[PDB]
């Protein structure tokens, strides 16, 4: 891997200084930091052509950068605010617009860490009426009550991840749309043949990777500390 970024995921409270790193091995003069937001594409924040030459892009406010070495270009959020929630991409270029992008940093900035909450996850079993009508069987997974919106859902059949027959909503919905800190919910479907669902030896699991608090974060509530964690739900196949 020529271009590497750290961290891959981070959650932060507002008002904190946050640093993102980009490193390369080819020693290209030109390095860049962009942010991606839905409907806006990739917008340039800052760029550098040599160690101590720095140039503002279109959205430089709230950010600083340093080019510490030929190989390294650091981005800082000086005092994080919620509208800095984004996917951040660093890039290098050769002298002929040959770009190489890092794999991305997903950053979420929240006002109040007390609102962080892992999902509850439930699997809903196929309808007997679908089975009779179609000879197929759709399982539904629902992840509910999570905050912030920063999850990854997957399906596992007899212990291996599956992609075929799956559709997961592209974005979670807000459970309480009127609220700035509403919790979220997300659904997915996994469809199999009726025969495959009817085998009591087959095991189906919906897995939700949630990104929340870290070991270092303070927690003063009685409820479980809402750390980064996996929450699953399961069902076995059934003849009746």
């Amino acid at each position: 891997a020529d271009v590497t970024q750290t961290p891959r995921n981070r959650i932060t409270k507002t008002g904190k200084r946050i640093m993102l790193e980009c490193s390369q091995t080819k020693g290209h003069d030109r390095m860049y930091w962009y942010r991606q937001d839905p409907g806006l594409g990739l917008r340039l924040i800052y760029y550098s052509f040599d160690v101590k030459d720095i140039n503002k892009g279109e959205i430089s406010d709230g950010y600083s950068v340093s080019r510490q070495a030929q190989a390294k270009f650091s981005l800082s959020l000086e005092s994080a605010i919620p509208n800095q929630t984004a996917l951040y991409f660093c890039a290098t270029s050769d002298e002929s617009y040959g770009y190489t992008f890092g794999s991305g940093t997903r950053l979420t900035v929240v006002e109040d860490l007390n609102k962080v909450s892992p999902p509850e996850v439930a699997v809903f079993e196929p309808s007997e009426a679908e089975i009779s009508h179609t000879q197929k069987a759709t399982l539904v997974c629902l992840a509910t009550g999570f905050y912030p919106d920063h999850v990854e859902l997957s399906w596992w059949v007899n212990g291996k991840e599956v992609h075929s027959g799956v559709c997961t909503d592209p974005q979670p919905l807000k459970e309480q749309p009127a609220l700035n800190d509403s919790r979220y919910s997300l659904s997915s479907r996994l469809r199999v043949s009726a025969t495959f669902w009817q085998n009591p030896r087959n095991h189906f699991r919906c897995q939700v990777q949630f990104y929340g608090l870290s070991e270092n974060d303070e927690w003063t509530q009685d409820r479980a500390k809402p750390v980064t964690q996996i929450v699953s739900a399961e069902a076995w196949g059934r003849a009746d």
Partner: protein, 202 residues
């Protein structure tokens, strides 16, 4: 002064039809132009680029684009839309001899050819012994779309297409639920225009 324009944040194409994603630019001198594709939670992959050599530029997977100076365009095409072409596509241009600037992106939605539609609303029960349920509207064709809920305590997802490889079979669905015990699947999709022959089992 230089810009790049893609219009339509979300576009559709029928499965098996011509793909055409439009891009125009505003540079007085011809620029270099790029098309990138992105899958969900993944990075950017270059499909093809114009670098002042061939005007008909070919790319990976049957993609092509023709640079047309006189109408400042670089539209991306592919002869036949496949379900795997569902992704977000970005046109980009060189700027100020030092960077690439990106268009706003367009997400391509592929409408599966549903030749035997069997629209239906099913009720699904929790695998655990709550009496929780959800409602699944499924197996409708391309002429049906799902509307959002008119009730803040009823939740309804967008339609989603799944591709069951095991049977080479695609289908549309939307899911609805509510924390009200009285909520019924017969009524879940009452704000949607559904097929007159939708199956409602009892």
């Amino acid at each position: 002064a230089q810009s790049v324009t893609q219009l339509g944040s979300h576009v559709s194409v029928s499965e098996g039809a011509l793909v055409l994603l439009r891009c125009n630019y505003s540079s007085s001198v011809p620029p270099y132009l790029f098309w990138y594709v992105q899958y969900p939670n993944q990075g950017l992959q270059l499909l093809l680029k114009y670098t002042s050599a061939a005007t008909l530029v070919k790319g990976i997977n049957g993609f092509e684009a023709e640079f047309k100076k006189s109408e400042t365009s670089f539209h991306l095409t592919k002869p036949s839309a496949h379900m795997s072409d569902a992704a977000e596509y970005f046109c980009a241009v060189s700027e100020q001899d030092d960077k690439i600037i990106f268009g706003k992106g367009t997400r391509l939605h592929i409408l599966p050819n549903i030749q035997n539609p069997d629209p239906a609303v099913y009720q699904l029960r929790d695998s655990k012994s709550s009496d929780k349920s959800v409602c699944l509207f499924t197996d409708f064709d391309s002429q049906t779309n799902v509307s959002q809920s008119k009730d803040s305590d009823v939740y309804i997802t967008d339609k989603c297409v799944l591709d069951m490889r095991s049977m080479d079979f695609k289908s549309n669905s939307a899911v609805a639920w509510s924390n009200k015990s009285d909520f019924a699947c017969a009524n879940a999709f009452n704000n949607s225009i559904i097929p007159e022959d939708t199956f409602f089992p009892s």
